[PDB]
Design a protein around this ligand. Structure first.
Ligand SMILES: [Gd]
Ligand SMILES: [Gd]
Ligand SMILES: [Gd]
Length: 136
């Protein structure tokens, strides 16, 4: 499994997402235990724009390891990209409960409320983002 996985990683690193998907899937057929491997498969589908696949593989990563702030955040991003703002808010909130440090993540939670037309919360979360990073 480990060898196929590293081949997928090398393809991913040069931007070849369809090859990374082929080799990650071969790795996961031989050993499905690693949360991080499912997460990297989700990321490959996300980069290709196949967001429903990204969601399925992020959810599989989180089933195996629910303490990944990064996995919740990327799950939120995949829902955001489908126009599923209610789900994006839920998963962004779960990510920020595990790790409140990223200005960028608060900002995106603000963006999801803005897209729902809930401007109060958009302002609450934009203000949290700008306290952490006023540069944009
Ligand atoms: Gd390719
Ligand atoms: Gd596609
Ligand atoms: Gd799909």
């Amino acid at each position: 499994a480990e060898a196929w996985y590293n081949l997928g990683n090398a393809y991913y690193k040069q931007g070849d997402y369809d090859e990374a998907i082929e080799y990650y899937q071969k790795a996961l057929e031989l050993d499905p235990r690693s949360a991080e491997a499912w997460y990297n498969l989700g990321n490959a589908y996300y980069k290709q724009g196949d967001y429903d696949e990204a969601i399925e593989y992020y959810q599989k990563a989180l089933e195996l390891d629910p303490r990944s702030a990064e996995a919740w955040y990327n799950l939120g991003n995949a829902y955001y990209k489908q126009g599923d703002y209610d789900e994006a808010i839920e998963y962004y909130q779960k990510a920020l409960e595990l790790d409140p440090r990223s200005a960028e993540a608060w900002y995106n939670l603000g963006n999801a409320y803005y897209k729902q037309g809930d401007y109060d919360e958009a302002i609450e979360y934009y203000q949290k983002a700008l306290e952490l990073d006023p540069r944009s």
